[PDB]
């Protein structure tokens, strides 16, 4: 029986509890949860919506970013479809709206309503800019839902619009948030177009965006004020074309995601994505892995972040079909030991059932957790309600776990936490 | 065994089916469902929300009226509370808003937000009129949520408001719906105050109301454009004071509602309510009753409508505690026979589980049905969702039942329907 | 199929509802529920606890009487046992206590406690009278629990008792309730012994009894102030001896109770009980029966009350084993028609599941209902709680049913009620 | 309560049993079940598969016909789709195959396999005829699956086919079943093409069809040897175009099927279908109806068969939503009384749960039953197994019911059956 006695033992979240430490924390608000998703992407909260076709599409990715997390768009769809979700997420908010929706003065109120309910943004857009033609885009005026509420379906846009000479316009393509705020206050307006030397429409700044930029300072934003979003790719020859079109559609990170990340296909994919200027301009996250040697390999291939989890859940296809997997706490412990020394953030992916588990994942070295089941069947997933409050409570649980380790930040949580193992 | 053989048999909804008749109906939209609630109150759809503390308070009464039905506010609360719900329902929409919410120019943006979220209307109000003082109410300007979105909590209302000289005002206290519509179109504004000879604020007309008055032509409205609502009273000495305060708060009908309406207390209450000018200005509905002689008595007492149903449900307190009741179809058949001859509408109250039952209730002579259980636990009741779509489907079922009797109107449904009795 | 078509149909309680009548009742308290149990026994409420070994022994019989009803002691026990329960019920309260518990001055505090917890009364007795000897019973003093609370188990009763010269005594063997009340008020005492010309103890009047006689004016009392109780006998040769010992133990009525009362054994038993002076001094109730001819026979045999019900419940031994029975409403209708004309009260026995059923039983002509299941498993039955509140709610239901028939009394309920028959 | 007492009572199948009659039947096989579907369509067994999108498409319609019944193709699909199912059913078997599948000699074995698995027939076709070109169709040879079993995907059809000079051919376009049988026996062949004066392919006769025509003499066949099938239409303007395309695709009857057949829309549709030569060449069946007057109306409109059943099932949309319907036994009794006198067959549609119910339907006057639920979830419906054995047992039950009425035929079953009504 010696061969059996020498098999090591792996621990999942349910095997351990965080041991209560000395805590100097004197206020719940002193606990900071900002963290890294990959070498070059910070997040206010360490929550990632899983790239599952039951969890993360446009609406989920928008909500996560607004909470200060991020979502990874899944790849079980056509390249065109996956880029379309991406474009919509990027369209959700901005500072300078590139290519704002326009309409022509001799179109009807019916066509205006259709323009305002554009499918390029969930919920449509708040106004249409009336310009002379699609070629030149000389700004003549503006039309909102308010301008249509008493019109007959056939009335001209020109009859109804606010003319440009009664609008507040700017030619400052570098206008600051304080500047356009002042413009909106002085002019009592809610839309400021940016036009060029000859009155041609270049951008739109909306009061709706200015308000978001002043309030939810937690949102995950790219440099243009748009919501952060990531997207997954496979490793097949065609996934490279998918990656390129995703980066061009606006992806902020790429996630190489196959069930068995400690494979030559996965490493070579990482090398490929990093070695092409069309894709090396965003961080490359790779997985899934469960061992230190795997973590070594992917890091050495160039990965900017690792996704941890092979057969993490107690009943999952990987365990029942192939018989493979690693209990997730051991896997997070083994992988982050290697990755910490290399400065590579780790996503703990799978097997998390409660906010208490998130605290253990971080305590065991992860920088973010990825959530599938806990977020499926929320409103924004493709019954549980809206995902925002679930996420906020999860972060609340984590903060509470952090205080039990006496940690005021994610690094401290990783350095300070001590586990104790249960049985029955 | 002869004494048992001579007991008559009563039928409930589940004993019968509507027999399919010859139908000339060539379109679902040819079926008209307008009906009478009482001698002087018409309704577009024959649905009444029951005066139960689990069903009908402000939100339910508002929704029913908007669907074209009505709700009866229950009396299991203080007179002040019941009038407060009434006032709020009346505040939900109007044509001329009497006593519109005001604010003073040296108040703060924080006080403006509080004014805009007034508890006198569910959802607050859409604007505040800035006037010189509460005494004189000289109109200086207007302030909306839009005007506050970039203000600091301590900024003056005067700094933020649209001044009156930039507003559209009217002195026409008799302005028509077409008139103020034109004012709103020409001026691109969404609020038109009505002021007096010296600029004192008298009324407010809002674009929000004008739009409702043009669209949902089905709503149950009093002469001022407000939503129709009724309220219940008991028969005790104090219920007369309740009735008077309810009429003065705006009730459109009073419902005398006790479990045993064929009683001297109930008749005398009806005589009392009709014999006092403070209450005889609205229709008096009375119940509950289940026999022809009872219907006779209440009509003779002066009732403008009868509410039918004593022990209507298969398992209800009345049957289990007292052992009394009448199967509801027989009760509707007996009572409406008497009432039809007298021109007195009948509410079939209780025992309705499906839209099919509503069709039988009407088929058996009722002019309206009252719904408790089917409407409890909707959003607007104090999980099923919003009540609007449930009501719309119920009316859909009724229209379908009407077509099976080949009826294009409620009268025809009552005159044409024939029943067949089931068993096992 | 003609032979089947001619079988008559019988109705149980669940086939009918009381039809709501015109009610002049202007207050719940105007409804009087007093009724007759037998020709010579009135009751404040028409509730009888069934003579079942799971329902009615001493504690149940006491509670029913205190509520204003009565219990029938069951006969499934030895004559000695059944008389013992009877004696205890009679011992529960009185005006003049015959043979009050005594003790001798040289007995110990331990023996006093044992005397005070006499098993002849549930709860023991409130005091012991200290007399000179069992033969003469010359009153020397009184001892209560209060007098023992600081005594050692071996202290003499004489050391602890209140001596007679400090007591309030009376020689008035005909003392009235107002008289002894005055004695108790002037003397601040709670026990007044009645002694004879030579100081020999004859009776005891206790403040506890005086208080009951002033408060619960609803209790069912015999002429001596004791609780009313009845007892059941069979029809075998030995049941005559049981009847005689029961009457002598204090029974106020005898109930001849066999499953098939329309039998020669039952009639002859009634003739026997009525024809013997040892038993003809209390009313003779007989049953069980379900037909008019049976009611005729027993009345003609001399019965002072009939107990109605043969196979009354839907699942009972009589129906499943023998296949016999009558639906209980028909049985009550048939039997009381005969009995009303003869002035013989009827107990509706069995098949009652709710207070609504009690109202139907009375409505169908019964003068009392007998309850088994509804009272079993109450505290006073040999989990539901105490029987008092269950009984009070049952009477409440009946009063409510009475108001639906517009009846202010039991006779009116019987004369006025009208039924309607249900189906599905 | 008089108005309730006068409502008539309707019976469903579960209210009655067939009364056993004197039976002279001396063998199960003496019971003949042939019947009429409509004035001009006979069936060997009275079973019709309901025109429900869960029951009857191509496979169901084929199986029913082979059992000797018929299926009605449902209309919840596009005209093109409904005709496509029709064409396939007609393609299932034939005597002379019109337009048999061909192939050209220089096509490949791969293209032959694709031809043999044509989607125009469930299961494909048994051979391809090799002809010179699509224009002329000069027969050069024949190719079957057997001819391909050792070929490489690129081998020429010409290399593999049996050449025409080794085939058995006929020029007899009127060849009888005995004639072509003899040809197949003498020539040991399984396919006999019919060619014209110049060797052009006109028809194909297959051994597979000859065998079916000799064995299952019960099948429902049109004059060409194809399986009988019917199709449903609505009453909207476009259903006339659907009817015309269905007749042209080969429909043997049309079924006008709306929930409320006693309507002007339905009558006018019947008049329309009968008054157009494009549709008056097949029988017009109409429904659904439940009254004698309705039966009168449709017959008078010209209907060749009535479909009986409005709200036939205990829990169906019609009863729960509209509250309408007729217990199905009464409805069959009322309608067939009228229709018998006019020679118009009746389909009892709905509410049948067991083969015993089928016997009652026939006993009550129906000529056929329509089955939905009992046939859904069989293999041939779009788990219960194959529909053939279920149908055969149903017919077995009916034959047994027929023997209990002592009937040797459907007419006798209708004339002889007597019902008895149950209760609990
Ligand atoms: N007006 C306008 N808004 C756009 C456009 N594209 C994206 N948006 C976004 O849509 C929002 C428009 O304003 P609203 O309609 O008030 O949106 P909301 O209040 O968040 O709902 C802003 O957040 C814009 O950044 C566009 O082309 N025109
Ligand atoms: N502005 C204003 N509205 C009022 C007042 N009282 C009731 N209302 C009603 O509240 C609504 C105000 O407009 P909104 O805030 O846009 O309401 P909504 O769009 O229905 O939500 C109108 O329907 C008014 O009739 C009031 O005092 N001021
Ligand atoms: N003291 C006394 N009470 C008796 C006797 N027999 C019956 N009782 C009854 O028991 C009660 C005695 O008083 P308490 O001990 O206060 O009884 P309780 O307050 O009802 O408990 C009275 O109701 C008496 O009628 C007796 O022999 N002596
Ligand atoms: N060979 C052939 N058969 C056809 C064609 N169209 C329909 N069929 C039918 O398909 C069957 C072909 O024979 P098999 O392939 O043996 O069919 P099966 O044995 O019933 O399976 C016959 O019943 C034909 O009537 C056709 O174009 N060619």
Author numbering:
A (entry chain A), B (entry chain A), C (entry chain A), D (entry chain A): 3 to 384, 436 to 477
Give the text the authors published on this PDB structure.
Here, we demonstrate the determination of the crystal structures of T. brucei GMPR; a protein that, unlike the GMPRs of host animals, possesses a CBS domain. Our kinetic and structural analyses clearly demonstrate that the CBS domain has a pivotal role in the allosteric regulation of the activity and structure of TbGMPR, facilitating the transitions among three conformations: a tetramer, and octamers with relaxed and twisted conformations.
We further determined the structure of the wild-type TbGMPR complexed with GTP (TbGMPR/GTP) at 2.50-Å resolution. In this structure, single GTP molecules were found only at the allosteric regulatory site on each subunit of TbGMPR/GTP, indicating that GTP acts only as a ligand. The overall structure was almost identical to that of C318A/GMP (RMSD = 0.66 Å for Cα atoms). The hinge motion in each subunit and the twisted conformation of the octamer upon allosteric binding of the ligand were also observed in TbGMPR/GTP. The present crystallographic study of TbGMPR shows that both GMP and GTP share the canonical site 2 on the CBS domain, whereas nothing was observed on the canonical site 1. However, the affinity of GTP to the canonical site 2 was higher than that of GMP as observed in the fluorescence quenching assay. These findings indicate that, in the presence of sufficient concentration of GTP, GMP no longer activates TbGMPR since the canonical site 2 has been occupied by GTP. In the presence of GTP, the initial velocity of TbGMPR was upregulated in a concentration-dependent manner, and the EC50 value was estimated to be 4.8 µM.
